[PDB]
Structures are given as C-alpha cells and as structure tokens.
Symmetry: C4
Subunit: 388 residues, 4 copies
Amino acid sequence: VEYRNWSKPQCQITGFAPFSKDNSIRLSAGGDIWVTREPYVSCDPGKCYQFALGQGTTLDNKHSNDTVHDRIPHRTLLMNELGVPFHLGTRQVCIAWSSSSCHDGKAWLHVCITGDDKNATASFIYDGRLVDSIGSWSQNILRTQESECVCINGTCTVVMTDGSASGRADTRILFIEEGKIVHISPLSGSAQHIEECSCYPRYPGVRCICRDNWKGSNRPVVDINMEDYSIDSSYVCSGLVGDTPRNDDSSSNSNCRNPNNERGTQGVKGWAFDNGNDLWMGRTISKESRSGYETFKVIGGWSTPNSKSQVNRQVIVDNNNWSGYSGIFSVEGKSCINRCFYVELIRGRPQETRVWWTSNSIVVFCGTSGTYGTGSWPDGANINFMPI
Amino acid sequence: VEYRNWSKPQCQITGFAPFSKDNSIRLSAGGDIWVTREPYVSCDPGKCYQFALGQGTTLDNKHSNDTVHDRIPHRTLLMNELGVPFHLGTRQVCIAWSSSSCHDGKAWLHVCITGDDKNATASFIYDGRLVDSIGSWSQNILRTQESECVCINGTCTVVMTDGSASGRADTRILFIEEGKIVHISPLSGSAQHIEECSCYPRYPGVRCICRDNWKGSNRPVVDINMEDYSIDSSYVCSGLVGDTPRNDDSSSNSNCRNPNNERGTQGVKGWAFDNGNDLWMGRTISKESRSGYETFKVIGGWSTPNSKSQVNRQVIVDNNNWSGYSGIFSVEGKSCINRCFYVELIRGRPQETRVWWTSNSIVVFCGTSGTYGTGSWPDGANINFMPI
Amino acid sequence: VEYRNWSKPQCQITGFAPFSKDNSIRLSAGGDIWVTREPYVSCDPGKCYQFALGQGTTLDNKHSNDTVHDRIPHRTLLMNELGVPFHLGTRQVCIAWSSSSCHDGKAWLHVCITGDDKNATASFIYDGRLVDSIGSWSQNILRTQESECVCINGTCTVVMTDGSASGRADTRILFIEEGKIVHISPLSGSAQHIEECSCYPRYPGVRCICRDNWKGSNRPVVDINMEDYSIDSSYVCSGLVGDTPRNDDSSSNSNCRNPNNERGTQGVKGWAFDNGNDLWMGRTISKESRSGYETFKVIGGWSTPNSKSQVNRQVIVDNNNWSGYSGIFSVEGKSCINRCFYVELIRGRPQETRVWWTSNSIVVFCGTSGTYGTGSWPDGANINFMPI
Amino acid sequence: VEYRNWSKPQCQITGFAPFSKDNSIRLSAGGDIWVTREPYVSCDPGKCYQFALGQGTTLDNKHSNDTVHDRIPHRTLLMNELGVPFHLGTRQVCIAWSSSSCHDGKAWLHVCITGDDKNATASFIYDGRLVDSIGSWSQNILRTQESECVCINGTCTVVMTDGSASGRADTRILFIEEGKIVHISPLSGSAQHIEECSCYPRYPGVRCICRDNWKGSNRPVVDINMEDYSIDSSYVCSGLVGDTPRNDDSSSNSNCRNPNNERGTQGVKGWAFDNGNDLWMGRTISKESRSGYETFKVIGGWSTPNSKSQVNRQVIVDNNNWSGYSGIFSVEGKSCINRCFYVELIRGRPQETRVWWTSNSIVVFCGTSGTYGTGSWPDGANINFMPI
Ligand SMILES: *[C@@H]1O[C@H](CO)[C@@H](O[C@@H]2O[C@H](CO)[C@@H](O[C@@H]3O[C@H](CO)[C@@H](O)[C@H](O[C@H]4O[C@H](CO)[C@@H](O)[C@H](O)[C@@H]4O)[C@@H]3O)[C@H](O)[C@H]2NC(C)=O)[C@H](O)[C@H]1NC(C)=O
Ligand SMILES: *[C@@H]1O[C@H](CO)[C@@H](O[C@@H]2O[C@H](CO)[C@@H](O[C@@H]3O[C@H](CO)[C@@H](O)[C@H](O[C@H]4O[C@H](CO)[C@@H](O)[C@H](O)[C@@H]4O)[C@@H]3O)[C@H](O)[C@H]2NC(C)=O)[C@H](O)[C@H]1NC(C)=O
Ligand SMILES: *[C@@H]1O[C@H](CO)[C@@H](O[C@@H]2O[C@H](CO)[C@@H](O[C@@H]3O[C@H](CO)[C@@H](O)[C@H](O[C@H]4O[C@H](CO)[C@@H](O)[C@H](O)[C@@H]4O)[C@@H]3O)[C@H](O)[C@H]2NC(C)=O)[C@H](O)[C@H]1NC(C)=O
Ligand SMILES: *[C@@H]1O[C@H](CO)[C@@H](O[C@@H]2O[C@H](CO)[C@@H](O[C@@H]3O[C@H](CO)[C@@H](O)[C@H](O[C@H]4O[C@H](CO)[C@@H](O)[C@H](O)[C@@H]4O)[C@@H]3O)[C@H](O)[C@H]2NC(C)=O)[C@H](O)[C@H]1NC(C)=O
Ligand SMILES: *[C@@H]1O[C@H](CO)[C@@H](O[C@@H]2O[C@H](CO)[C@@H](O)[C@H](O)[C@H]2NC(C)=O)[C@H](O)[C@H]1NC(C)=O
Ligand SMILES: *[C@@H]1O[C@H](CO)[C@@H](O[C@@H]2O[C@H](CO)[C@@H](O)[C@H](O)[C@H]2NC(C)=O)[C@H](O)[C@H]1NC(C)=O
Ligand SMILES: *[C@@H]1O[C@H](CO)[C@@H](O[C@@H]2O[C@H](CO)[C@@H](O)[C@H](O)[C@H]2NC(C)=O)[C@H](O)[C@H]1NC(C)=O
Ligand SMILES: CC(=O)N[C@H]1[C@H]([C@H](O)[C@H](O)CO)OC(C(=O)O)=C[C@@H]1NC(=N)N
Ligand SMILES: CC(=O)N[C@H]1[C@H]([C@H](O)[C@H](O)CO)OC(C(=O)O)=C[C@@H]1NC(=N)N
Ligand SMILES: CC(=O)N[C@H]1[C@H]([C@H](O)[C@H](O)CO)OC(C(=O)O)=C[C@@H]1NC(=N)N
Ligand SMILES: CC(=O)N[C@H]1[C@H]([C@H](O)[C@H](O)CO)OC(C(=O)O)=C[C@@H]1NC(=N)N
Ligand SMILES: *[C@@H]1O[C@H](CO)[C@@H](O)[C@H](O)[C@H]1NC(C)=O
Ligand SMILES: [Ca+2]
Ligand SMILES: [Ca+2]
Ligand SMILES: [Ca+2]
Ligand SMILES: [Ca+2]
C-alpha cells in the first residue's frame, strides 16, 4: 500500500449525480439510531465512509432531550460505511465534539477535540493508536473542519481555529505525519475569520473553502503549500455568495480579498471548488435560514470579482425542507480526481419544537461528466410521527 | 482477480431445489426490519447477495404508512449477504426507486435511478465510486431491470426503458465498462414493449426475458450481442405464457414474434430460460393476480410456436399465498453455469388492508441435476399479528 | 488451503472444560432474538460457529406462538460465530427443518432438508452454491444429523434416514465431494433404528453414535469406511446407557449388538466417543425427561458389554434445569484431535406452559488434558420474566 | 506474523489524552445493551478491543434485576472493537466471572474462570480453541486480573489468586505458550496479598501493579522474570497511595516493602507504572468510595519511599460522578511502547437504588508526549431516565 498523492487532474464535470442517502431520521422512528450532527464523508482508496458527531444517545431515548447543544463530554466520532445508518453496532472512533478525518493511502487519521470550552484537547489518532495531542492555544473552543482532512505523500493537513466566534481568532494549519504533528503554520493572507474548512487536494497543494463567522457572507479561501508549509488566504470571488445568512443575489458582493460585511455574523459550514476561472458551489436556497440546498457553476466565479452569471443549477433539497452543514470530499478515479459533497439534513430543534431533540440525516452527491435530471432528496421524516 | 466470461455450458437441470428464504415479514413483527419491494439476487464469484429497494423506513414505524407507492426520494438500494434479512445494519448502496446490480469478476456495478418522474437520473457506481450518469431520454419514468445485469470480459450490459407504460416506449441497451457507459444500442427486433428484463449470460452473448406491459401476456425476449452491440428481440414461443394477467392455458397463445393481445395490458416481472428447444419458466399460479408461484419445463417451449406440453412442474408458493416479482440469476459452477431464481412475496396493500404498509420477503431456488420432492414456501406472516 | 484429513491421534482427556454459552433465552426477554431448536457447533480450521434451526421468527413476536412444532416451511439454518447469539443480523444459510454442516478444509458444506413430510427435498450447498439435491426415498420425513458432518481428504459423509419413527426405517450414508453426491451406501450391521447421528473423525474412518427411536435406550453406533464406502453398525457396549427415556442404572443393559428393549421407544439426540476400551459419554441426568446433563467415562464402556463402572463424572446442567439435544464436534489441535460437545437447553413448551413458544440456548464444553472443578450452567432464564 | 517482544523503550509522556468512550448506559435507555462489569481493553498489533464480563442479560430486561452479584453461571466474556458498545451482535468469547485476555502477535489468548466458588475452573483458549484448563487450588474463588495479560516471544504470563479475600491467599504466576501452561511460579517477595493485577511489558520482563485486599491501601507490585520464571514483589513507594479505601494524603504512607495497614481491608482494581524514579498513577478522587478519577505523576514515586510531590495532575472523572475499576494496557508505536488506561464507570446498585441493576460504561485515555487541556468524562446517564 502506497501513500496517496492525488496527482491526477480534476475531473471535468457537468454537474452532480445522486450517490447516497441514509434516511437516519425516518428510521429513528422505528429503530434505535444515534442522535448526531456535523456529519461528513471520507473514503479510503477502496470505499467511502460516513462520519458524524454522536450525542451519546439514540433518538428514541430520554437522553435525546436537549441535544441541540454543541458540546458535551459524551459526543464521540461515529464511523460507518457510507449508506449504513448509525445503528447500535456503530463504532465510536474517538471522543469528539469537533473532528476531522482522512486516509493517507495507508491508514486513517482522526483529529478529535473534546473537553472544557476554555481548555480543550485535540487527540491525533493514526492507524488505530493515539500518536499526538495538542491543547487549546487561545482558551476559547479549539475547533476544526467537521469534514475530511487531506493527505499528500504521507503528510496530512488540517485547519484548526481557537478564539472568538465573532471577532479576530487564532487559526493554525497543522501538518501531520503518521499521526505526529511535524509542523504548524499560522494563518496568513487576507481571510479575517476561518472556521469549518472544506478542503480538497489540488496537487501539489491543498485548497480550502471555509466559513467566516464574523464579517463575511462570502466564503474565505485557505491555500496550503505542502512543500514549504506556507499559507495564503482570501475570499471566493463569486458575487453569488455561499454563506448563510447573506444578502439576496441582487445585492450581494465579493471582491475576492475582504469579508463583504453583508450579514457577515453567524454562518454555516459549506464548500466550493475552482475549475479554471469558474467555480462550482453549493449553498442553502434560503438566504437567512438553513433551508433548501442548491448547486451551480458560476462563470468566472473563481477569477472574476463579483461575478453572478450561473449555469447548470441543480436543486438538491427544495426550500420547503431543512438542510444544514455541507462539505466536500474527493474520490480518486482511474484518470482524474472527482469532487463530491454531502449535505446535513437537520431535524428537530430549534426549528421544530414538537420534539425536544436535534439530529440529522444525510444526502450525498458526486461530480459527473455524464448527464442527469431533476429532483429533491430531503430528510423525509414526518415530525408528527417522531418520538419527542 | 480476472473478469467473468461465463464461458461454460449451461448446467443441465431436472428442476429446482430450495436455496434461501429470509422470512422478512414474520421478523418485522418482532424486530426492526426494512420495508422493501422489488428484491433480487446476484452473486460475486464467491457468495450471493440479496438486494431490494427500501422505502426509507422500517415496517414497525409510522413511516411505513402508504408505502404501496412506487417512487419516493427516500428509496435506496439495500444489499446484504443472501439470507441476512434487511436489519438496521443493512448498507444502503445508492439512492434508487429502480435498480440493477452485477459483479464483473473484479467489482460490483450498481445502476441506480431516482428523482422526478419526468426527469430522472440514473447513476452508475462501480467499485464504490460514481463513474457515470445519464438523464431521462423520454421524460417518462426512466426505469430498468430490478434484477441482476450481466458482464462478459469486463463489459456489463443492462436494459433500460423510458416512456409510456401502456404504449410504444423508448428502450435502450447500455454497455458499461468499469462503470463507464461506452455504447448505447436502441432496441431492435419484434418486441413491442420491454420492461424489467431478467437477463442471463448465454456465452458469447446475453439473453433476457422481460415484461411487455402493453399488448402482450407472452413475455418478450431480448438478445444482446456483446461483440458488436447488435440487438434482436422477439417473444417466448411457449403457448403457456408467463405474464400476469394472462388468458387461461386453454385459450392463451404465442407465435414467437408478436405480442399476443390477450389481456396484454399491465403485467409482472418474471423470467424464463432456454435449453435447446425446450423452455424452463416460472409464473404466478393465478392468471389474474400475483398469487401463488409455479415452475415447469415446456417441451418445445423455446422453438415451437404455441407449445403447451409441460413436464417437471413444481409448486414454489401455493395459490393461497401472495407472490409478486420473480427474476433469474446465474451462478458459476465447476463445469457449468447454473440458473437460479428468486420470488418476491408481497404482503400488505393493496391486497391486505388490515395493515397500511406494503413490503415483501423472498424465497430462492436454484437449478439442480439431482432429485427433489414437493412443498410450499410462502411468506408465512400472519397479517393479524402485524403492526398496522 | 488444503483438505482436512484429521490424521492425528485423539487427544487424551481427563474430562471437559467450559468453552461457550450464549444465554439466548435470557437475552430474548430484552432484545430481538431468533426462536430456535436443534442447535449444534462446527468449526472451520480457524474458528467455531454455532448453528440452529430457526422458526422463522423472534421470541418476542406473536409468531413465536406454537413453535413447539418440528417442521414448517419457514425454518432456516442459522449460522453465527460461536458465542454470538442469534440476533437479527444472523445469516439464514438455507431452508431447513433438519440439517447437517461441515467444513472440508476449503469450504462449508450444508445439508438442508425442507418441504412436505411425505416428499421432502435435501439440498446440498457447497462453497456458497447449490451443487446437488435428493428427494425422499421412503416418503416419510427424510431427516439427518442435526449436528456436524465429517470430511476426510475432500470427501464429506453424512447419515440420513427416511421412514418410520417407531419401526424399521431406511437409513443411508452419503458421500459428498464439493457438494456433489458421489456414492450412497445403505445402512448395514446390527443397528435396527438410526436417527440424529453424532459423528466424528476417527482416521482413517468416521464413527457415529446415534439415536434409536424404536427399541433401544442404548445408543446405536455407525461406522463409516471412507475408503471403500462400506458400513457397519452396532450398539454402545456400556451398561450405563445414553438415551432418554431409559431404565435406571441398576436395571439398564446393553450387549453391544442389539437394541435393549428397555423403554426403547422415543429418545433424544446424544453423543459418546471411544478411547481404547473406555467410553466418554454424556446424557440427561433424568432417566425419563430432558432434564439435567452429565458426562463421565465408563471403564470398559466401549469394549465390555454391560460395563457400569464410571469415573470422572461432571455435572454440566443440574437436574433442576431443562436440557435437550446434545452433540459432538471435533477440533484439530497442534498434535491431536480434541472432542467437544454442546447441549441444547430447551425452554418453553411442552414443559413450561406459561409461554406459548419453544426455544433454546446452548452451553458448550471441550475436552481437556488439564484439570477442572465443578458447576452447573443451565439456560438461566426466569420463565416468569418472559414474553409469553 | 511474528511474536510480540515489546522490545522498545517506554514512550516518554507528559500526561494522557482522550482515546475512547462507549456511552453504554446512556444507550441502554434506548436500545438493547449488555449489562456488564469488570471491563478492560487490549489490542492486537493492528487494533484495540474492549472486553467486559456480561451478566447474561441486557439492561432493559427483567433479568437485569440484582446483577450487583459477582458470580453467576451466565457471565461470559464480551469482546468488541474499542468504541463499539456491547449490542446484541457482541461475541461472547467464553464463560467467565473472572478473566484476562492478550494477543501474542499471532493469536488471542483468553483466560476464563467460571463455576462453583469452592471449585472453579479456569479455561485457556488460544487461537479459537480450548488448549488447557486448571482447577481451583485453594478452593476459595480462583480469580485473575480483569485486564490484559502480557506476552513476550510467544510466552504469555498471567497472575491468579485463590484463597481468602481478607487474609493470606495463594497467588501463582502462569506462563502459557499457545494456550498451553508450561510453568507455574508461586508468588515470592514482600507483597502480602495480590488481586486483580494490572500488568505491562517492561522488556525483558513484565511488571504488575495490583490490589491488596487485606492490609494495604498502598498497591502491591509483582515483577515477573520471563527468562527463568522467577518472581519478586513489593509495594509502590509513593506516599500518595492508589487503593480505595485509603487515608487522606496527609496521613497516608508506604515504605515500598510492606502493606501500610491504613484502611487496608477491601480495595479496588487499579494501576500505575514506573518511569525511572518517577511514577505515573491513577486513583479514585474519593478516598472511601468509587467516585471520581484522577491521574498524576509522583516525583520519586517509584524509587523514594513515602514520596508525595505530584505534578501533571489530570481529572478524568470529576468527584460528582461514579467511577470503578481501572487498568493499564500497552500499545506498540513506531519507536516506543505507549501506556494507556481505561476507567470503569459503574452505574446502578449499590450506590444508585432507583434502579435494580448494576452495569457500567467506559472511558479510555492514552499516554501522550504532546499537550492537552482539562475536562471530565463521566458515564453521563441520567439515573432518572433509566429503565429500573
Ligand atoms: C431536466 O433536468 C435538466 C438537468 O437538471 C434540466 O436542465 C437544467 O436546467 C437548469 C434550469 O434552467 C439550468 O440551470 C440554469 O442555467 C441558466 C443559464 O442557462 C441560469 O440562468 C439559471 O440560473 C437562473 O435561474 C435559476 C432558476 O432556474 C435561479 O435559481 C438562478 O438564481 C438564476 O436566476 C440556471 O442556473 C441548467 O443549466 C440545465 N442543465 C443542463 C445540463 O442543461 C432541465 O431543465 C430539466 N427539464 C425539465 C423541464 O425539468
Ligand atoms: C414428489 O415430488 C416429485 C417431484 O416434485 C413429484 O413428481 C412430479 O410430479 C409432477 C406432477 O405430476 C410432474 O409434473 C407434471 O408432469 C406432467 C407430464 O408428465 C404434466 O402433464 C403436468 O402438468 C399438468 O398437470 C399439472 C398439475 O400437476 C397442471 O398444473 C398443468 O397445467 C398440466 O395440466 C406436470 O407438469 C413432475 O414431472 C414430477 N417430477 C418428476 C421429476 O418426476 C411427485 O409427484 C411427488 N409425489 C407426491 C405424491 O407428492
Ligand atoms: C472439585 O471438582 C473435581 C472435578 O470435578 C471433583 O472431582 C471429581 O469428583 C467426582 C465425584 O466424586 C468423581 O467422579 C466419580 O468417580 C467415582 C469413581 O472414583 C464414581 O464412582 C462416581 O460415580 C458414582 O457417583 C456419582 C455421583 O458422584 C453417581 O452419579 C454415579 O452414578 C455413580 O454412583 C463419579 O463418577 C471424579 O472422578 C472427580 N474428578 C477428578 C478428576 O478427580 C471434586 O470432587 C470437587 N471437589 C468438591 C469437594 O466438590
Ligand atoms: C489547562 O490544562 C492544563 C493541562 O491539564 C492545566 O495545566 C495543569 O494544571 C495542573 C493543576 O495546577 C497541574 O498539576 C499540578 O501540579 C502541581 C505541581 O506543579 C501540583 O502541586 C498539583 O497537585 C496539587 O494540587 C492538586 C489540585 O490541582 C491537588 O489535587 C493535589 O493533591 C496537590 O495538592 C497538580 O499536580 C499540571 O501540572 C498542569 N499541566 C501542565 C502540563 O502544565 C491548566 O491548569 C489548564 N488551565 C485551565 C485554566 O483550566
Ligand atoms: C395511514 O395514513 C392514513 C392516511 O392519512 C390514515 O388514515 C386517515 O386518517 C385520517 C385521520 O383520522 C382520516 O380522516 C382519513 O379518512 C384516513 N384516510 C384514509 C384514506 O382512510 C391512517 O390512520 C394511517 N394509519 C395508521 C396506522 O396510522
Ligand atoms: C397462542 O395461540 C393460541 C391459539 O390461538 C391462543 O390460545 C387461544 O386463544 C383464543 C383467543 O384468545 C382462545 O379463544 C382459545 O381458547 C385459545 N386456544 C387454546 C388452544 O387454548 C393463545 O392466546 C396464543 N397466545 C398468545 C400469547 O397470543
Ligand atoms: C427486583 O427484584 C426484587 C426482589 O425480588 C423485587 O423486590 C421485591 O419484590 C417483592 C414482591 O413484590 C417484595 O415482596 C420484596 O420485598 C422485594 N424485595 C426487596 C429486597 O425489596 C423488585 O420488585 C424487582 N425489581 C423490579 C423493577 O422488578
Ligand atoms: C465546536 C463547536 O461547538 N462548533 C460548532 C459551531 C460554532 O459554534 C461556530 O462555528 C462558532 O464558532 O457552529 C455550529 C452551528 O451549527 O453553527 C455547530 C458546531 N457544533 C459542533 N462542532 N459540535
Ligand atoms: C419505476 C417504477 O415505478 N416501476 C414499477 C413498475 C411500473 O409501474 C410498470 O412496470 C410500468 O411501467 O411496476 C411495478 C409493479 O409492481 O407492477 C413496480 C415498480 N416499482 C419500482 N420500480 N419502484
Ligand atoms: C425432522 C424432524 O421433525 N425431527 C425431529 C425429531 C423426530 O421427530 C424424531 O427423531 C423421530 O423420527 O425429534 C425431535 C425431538 O425433539 O425429539 C426434534 C426434531 N425436529 C426437527 N428436526 N426439526
Ligand atoms: C471473582 C470475583 O468475584 N471478584 C470480584 C472481587 C473480589 O470479591 C475481591 O477482589 C475480593 O476477593 O471484587 C469486586 C469489586 O467490585 O470489588 C468485583 C469482582 N467481580 C468479578 N470478578 N466478577
Ligand atoms: C425535555 O426536558 C425539558 C426540560 O427539562 C422538559 O421540560 C421536557 O418535558 C422534556 N421532554 C420530554 C419529552 O421529556
Ligand atoms: Ca458569515
Ligand atoms: Ca402484459
Ligand atoms: Ca430410544
Ligand atoms: Ca486495600
């Protein structure tokens, strides 16, 4: 078994095709299924796995009460083959209320963060053993991607933040070899706030589209040089911005360099990726709430400031249904690297108060060079049918 | 691991022997079990798997209500080892309300159709990654086999239809290499309506017996040339016809060439295969309803128009019990290729209205050159014992 | 991987030590667990599996009602790693209300009998595919061992009976190569009724201790020559007899040759094996009912007619608790072949009428050359705590 | 695959980082989960497993009533991958109310004790088969480590005791090769009572920190010479003692040689390990009850009698929460052997009488050379939410 290098060109795509769906919430009404949030997907060279942060409880369980909260000691990282719902046989890979995972071609790396808000611990687990750990550097909720990290030639990279959720924070990029932290680079560039990066291999480096929770509804970009550990950052040029909340399409802006100061505070994890001058991106359909989900290509979305010409739109989840987090993952094909994405379908609180829990299912799409039609693939549970 | 060629003679058989049964519905009354329909079986070179289209819910679950419907966004393709019932640990292989799967000797191919009736998407997943996709070509419920596809020397073929369920439609035959569509041939020959083909290797080609939902209660045949992609089609010669509904045996006809125009509209997925001039086939015992299941050999059933001399009949499910879809699968033996079949045993609506759900179990038989007795292997659930 | 030959001497044992227990019935009161009976154990060269005949239902399930009956179409052979209780993820290996299984060193053979009492079918499944089948030869409940078959040098043998349960029947010994029946030998010798043989490798042949359901409370012996297919039979010499019912120790007899005509009608599956002139055997503690279970060595029990000197007794299940079937299995060690046994612990009807079902758990012991103490390892469920 | 030698230096650590947590009890309130106690962790060269002694029942089950008791015939050793909670698919590895397991690089050894208090049997199972057994030598509850044994170059060692729980007993050290007992050494040295040793490889030998249930609240040490089978023993030098009950830190003592006679009777399984003159250890936070859990390094804790200078303290479980047993396990890294530990989190009786059962979950930490923060990772179940 050899290290992944991801040294193939990016697959040229025409859009995305249905890949997976787990129906977690529908099943929870007739079976013992984990309460989760912050899911993601990552694949070893052979097969794909679905991940999520458990809440230390199943849904039909009095412990499901008040699971809207983000951080408790009982949250653990769950890992199943993609499409296997989180049943009671699911392995809890580590303790985590924030995480990132990736396979370097030989073994799995898991980055798991847990403990006190003001003094958290990140554990680094590789090939099934704890290899390293680091403590909070800013004493304010050390946190990471909530989607896959990326490895090239045996070095995995992950983006981590510690500090204010509504102001300048301390973001660092780690380089990890077989679970051992070998280098840490400070964030550099023009991005002013970085959270929950959705990263992907772009040989010879790694590129990330993240969440600015402070002043931007445009998404920050973090570029990682795997050769000399140097870091650059900016913002996605597209005038059709990807965060939520955000202004409507007719009044949104991005200059590629600065946070737009348009409903900048708060946000949601998301993704986008470049193709030459163009940009493929997803976002919630609603501009103010985590409702609906759409993807499209923005012409000049990567290179041209404030570009707003889109094409190849697809509805993933219609705007009558709840969405949530979304993130990218990459899958190596015979001759090219394909881009896929998942979306978290959040049910329960705070939006749906009939129940006292908060959980999610997922739906997953992959880049295609073929053709496709239309549809909508929401969570599908009837809130009135659920144990409260 | 080498590609399958299926280049062995067909096993000579005297009938069929019991192979598998999952007791899905009986178990659903005391356990969390998926609601399904449209099951099938396919085997890799080592072992067999049972497949089915889930309804995104378990049976003892309020979401089981009104699962009689064929197409919702939450249907996914399930896959377990044969004889492992669809419990909550079952892997959902892809999103699909119509599907076909097959192993080429190296990896699994999955053809998964989902989305809007008028604009569906078929995803092609090979070796655990999405490789290709195609959109609806006639904007009227793109649909496929609901049983195993067939691969020879690295090329897998599958039959798909788009268009009217009760009139001329657009049927195409796809040739797929490692998940990539390399050629598409239009249907040719005298078959006038093609649905839900049950295909099997007949080296050097592939042969399919299908469902004519328009004018024929005789089953159409599709012959696929894997070498030059040419297509031929006709109808099973046997005067004992295999569709449901159909005329009684004394007034049924087939001329090998045209739909018989006898209770031709509607139908059910089924199978048959040739042995020289003779035909082995199954069908429901009832001529108008999906009740009972019987197999027999028709002497001259392949070569002689309107032949009605049968022998070696076996009851699989007696006519007091519900059946449903049936399909063929092929298993490679030491010196010959054996033919097997499964029978879908539908319970619930529309026939059984005490409950509000629709689901199924399966029973499976394989060709034998030995001897055997008699029996009946129905679903076995007591509708009165079921959660409604 | 090479065929098993079992060409090592039998391990010299001092008695038996605890090996496994599944607690099936206790768990059934708080979890979804298969209803079973007629369990056994068999191991591949690496590890051991527990088998049983399911009743097509879990215990906490209205379908568990009236499962005291021996034969329905929904019974299937279940197979898990030893110690894994029959949960809903259990694989149903074949359709069977009577069975036998064994591994020849390369793959698993399953002999599965189902269908009508008067016209049953035995299916032979090898390496995951149906290879052969035979129909009933006496039209009266074709039946087999309910414990492991035995393979030497690629040839597996199994004992089958068809005909009266209370009079002369038609017993045959099959020889099977990779699932294919290659020879069938009639029973020969002085055994007058043969059922449910517990067989073991005794290189170069196979030896079986069985159940005479007609005239003997002494257990029949069947000796199988794997070289020329010849068959011999007799009765265990020991004056301490192994069947239930039987006379008490002071009035029981065996002459090694004929059924003793002592409470000979009815019986229970059991086991014993020879060591030189001596015999190791198990039996129920009660002489009339399937209660308790004990093992001991009879001095001269193999060679001396009516020998009644025992030593090294061990209580496996005390006489205040229900037992049932028991059988032998053999495990290859570094330098010798060890003998182990399981016992079926039957709960429910007909003995316990508070519940309407019949099921079992198991306890398993293996031969030891070391030392050991005392105990009792019954089912352990409180009948009053059970779903009825 | 080669035998383990553990011939690498001990990893230098700065403390411990979060590794695993199973949330057993929270899950038991909404799912079918085994009732357990006496858990531990052990890893093969690739991955880690969690073990525990089942009570032959799930928690939401009437059989969970009165499971506070230590020894019943239905207790079996459970084994899952670490982080997989004990669901119904869990393998019961052997019958046991006391156990120890370890992997020698090639296969698993299991030491399983069950049967009558006065006449127990220890079974030795290696590579999936029973290889040896030994009977009770003092007729008073033969018992062992309840944590991993240790193997070097194909020889595994385990510590066992038989005799008084509150007086002089008979402790022996077994050396086992491929499941076969090759030598037994009597305890020697100054330790006066030995139970439940937590052992670890310290090449070329093995070192154990145990429980003195008679006169010491200081923990006994047992040193095992794997080359000549010689045994030495003493007591942990640290004046900060590790047993419960114990004197408070101001009035506790140890002289490295003798039991301290400070609240010496009773106790709890625990651990510690040396690093030069220093000691890393864990213990309950409460000095009289199994509540809370803390780790720290004692400067001179290994070499200096009565040393009480600690540093690098970490709270694992705060003193408002129940703990229980704890034990060490060792994990081979690229260049060093790391030390890890688990903590048993006991819920139910006798401390919490709303419920009638006794069970536990686990939390697991591994040594780190990196940095870390603070937290508390208790069981987390709400006793009021539990089935009683
Ligand atoms: C069957 O399915 C196919 C494939 O999904 C589908 O074709 C697609 O239609 C959409 C919508 O027309 C196309 O995407 C659009 O492209 C135009 C540029 O040509 C953009 O201007 C559009 O964006 C505007 O309109 C959107 C609403 O449609 C707004 O949300 C957005 O803010 C803009 O105002 C949009 O991106 C897409 O390019 C094609 N795909 C392909 C490959 O042709 C087809 O319509 C379906 N057929 C039917 C009748 O259902
Ligand atoms: C024990 O089991 C064996 C094996 O199943 C069984 O033998 C089989 O009997 C059936 C029924 O007689 C045979 O099948 C028939 O073959 C004749 C030609 O010889 C056909 O004419 C029959 O078809 C007509 O009758 C059917 C009803 O039986 C109608 O449904 C049909 O429309 C036709 O009118 C039928 O195909 C079969 O050939 C044998 N199998 C073998 C290998 O011998 C035997 O009867 C069983 N014994 C008992 C008493 O259960
Ligand atoms: C601790 O455990 C050991 C191992 O189990 C145990 O030693 C065993 O005791 C039994 C009972 O005494 C021995 O078996 C007996 O052997 C004598 C011949 O020496 C037979 O006569 C006995 O059979 C008669 O008695 C039985 C009841 O005990 C009747 O059921 C039977 O019908 C006969 O009347 C019986 O087989 C056995 O040999 C030893 N095992 C060894 C290896 O020594 C020991 O007793 C236990 N200690 C205590 C005090 O519990
Ligand atoms: C963020 O996390 C870090 C890492 O956990 C943490 O630093 C640690 O603080 C503890 C507590 O001060 C240190 O442990 C102490 O070490 C001193 C010697 O230097 C000992 O005297 C202490 O023992 C006494 O006090 C204990 C209570 O704190 C008593 O229980 C005990 O009986 C003694 O009286 C204790 O061992 C530890 O060394 C550091 N760790 C490192 C690596 O620096 C830090 O405090 C956290 N920050 C916050 C604000 O949460
Ligand atoms: C399954 O769903 C159906 C449809 O909603 C339910 O039946 C309906 O119940 C409503 C409310 O009482 C009635 O007003 C309608 O007349 C019913 N519809 C039909 C078509 O009969 C039914 O209750 C559900 N089944 C279960 C078991 O909950
Ligand atoms: C198991 O099945 C039997 C047979 O139906 C049930 O016993 C019968 O119950 C009916 C209706 O409740 C009574 O009228 C009959 O008197 C019973 N028949 C017999 C033979 O006693 C029994 O109730 C079922 N058990 C459970 C728990 O459902
Ligand atoms: C657990 O078992 C105990 C003991 O049987 C039960 O408590 C007893 O109940 C009986 C009958 O009601 C009383 O007479 C005794 O006084 C009780 N014993 C004790 C020690 O209190 C208890 O009910 C069981 N728990 C549950 C939830 O079923
Ligand atoms: C570590 C932590 O709690 N991270 C958060 C996160 C966070 O609050 C913001 O991004 C602000 O910094 O946002 C939210 C959110 O849904 O917006 C979920 C996360 N939940 C978990 N990761 N557990
Ligand atoms: C795609 C789809 O909905 N196909 C159908 C199918 C169909 O309606 C006819 O064949 C007419 O074209 O028939 C039936 C049927 O039970 O008759 C089940 C199917 N259900 C599913 N495949 N889900
Ligand atoms: C095939 C069949 O029904 N065999 C029987 C069996 C049998 O009735 C006698 O041995 C008489 O011939 O006995 C019993 C019994 O417990 O005695 C269980 C079996 N149950 C099952 N094997 N399913
Ligand atoms: C074999 C046995 O029953 N051992 C004990 C044990 C024991 O009583 C003492 O150490 C004194 O000898 O302590 C306790 C304990 O929680 O204190 C748990 C054990 N339970 C089990 N191992 N099952
Ligand atoms: C959840 O907890 C809240 C706050 O304690 C309580 O008011 C509510 O009743 C709980 N919900 C359920 C379903 O028990
Ligand atoms: Ca924002
Ligand atoms: Ca038709
Ligand atoms: Ca008898
Ligand atoms: Ca003590």
